[PDB]
């Protein structure tokens with residue numbers, strides 16, 4: 001009886017995906033979850049992860065490749081790879097040349113989640129919910145503190161977002177952009193932020209304990225759906241702001257020391273089935289990377305422009321680039337200053 005160890009983001013699979021896979025294959029799955037690319041990167045760089053499959057964002061996977069922590073995927077063992085959208089593959093290939101190591105899973109944007117009724121109560125019916133001004137303008141964040149503000153604990157994403165908002169290159173390579181204007185704005189906003197966290201904001205939005213957050217798109221749409229099913233009167237929405245936003249592509253990868261690679265390939269092939277991955281999108285409110293799966297995705301998810309955004313919105317999205325050690329050091333130091341103080 002072989003097993004399979006999977007490490008994925010929290011709130012990123014359907015409730016029955018693993019159980020259905022177990023029943024069909026007789027494999028027992030050990031499934032654990034994270035909410036931080038930094039936590040996963042640290043595990044991969046410090047020693048064995050103990051997992052057969054892990055799911056980093058592609059921009060982090062680029063750095064992980066330089067350490068040799070993944071096994072190149074045997075495409076002969078992934079017959080339905082063709083189901084993957086070739087345009088998303090090409091974007092991920094910027095981080096993973098010729099798509100040797102990573103299987104695109106889901107993708108979304110880093111935008112603004114908010115409580116519709118509370119934001120209009122505080123900022124009025126003309127609140128700029130289509131703009132990063134809603135939370136990155138100090139005058140606005142000071143008022144929204146009344147009902148709670150959270151930021152992702154995602155340093156590379158938050159700094160890229162702030163740099164873009166400031167009219168800088170989102171992937172600026174000038175240290176002074178981080179230590180000066182980016183830090184200046186974040187510290188002006190810092191007094192109004194209740195916490196930095198990358199998963200507690202989902203239920204807090206759903207229960208009405210925070211009213212605005214920097215959040216991941218599908219996470220916020222999950223919060224909205226949780227509130228509706230609870231019939232608690234909380235109306236949550238998500239915005240991809242007009243100034244653009246970061247896009248991310250989360251990918252399955254196979255640690256080089258994975259014990260049960262054959263079982264791992266069986267699970268990747270299971271995910272490449274259009275019906276399996278469309279069912280996941282239906283429950284987690286994320287766009288998958290499977291072009292063959294799109295007709296099976298529920299209308300509610302597939303037609304949500306905050307999940308599958310239209311071309312004019314996609315044209316304003318940016319992606320993270322890997323920085324050299326100098327900028328990495330300055331960004332991390334600045335992040336700690338922003339959070340603590």
Ligand SMILES: COCCOC[C@@H](C)OC[C@@H](C)N
Nearest residue numbers: 085087088247314315317318
């Ligand atoms: C659904 O297929 C299109 C996939 O586009 C992904 C978006 C983020 O890229 C467009 C920008 C990044 N150049």
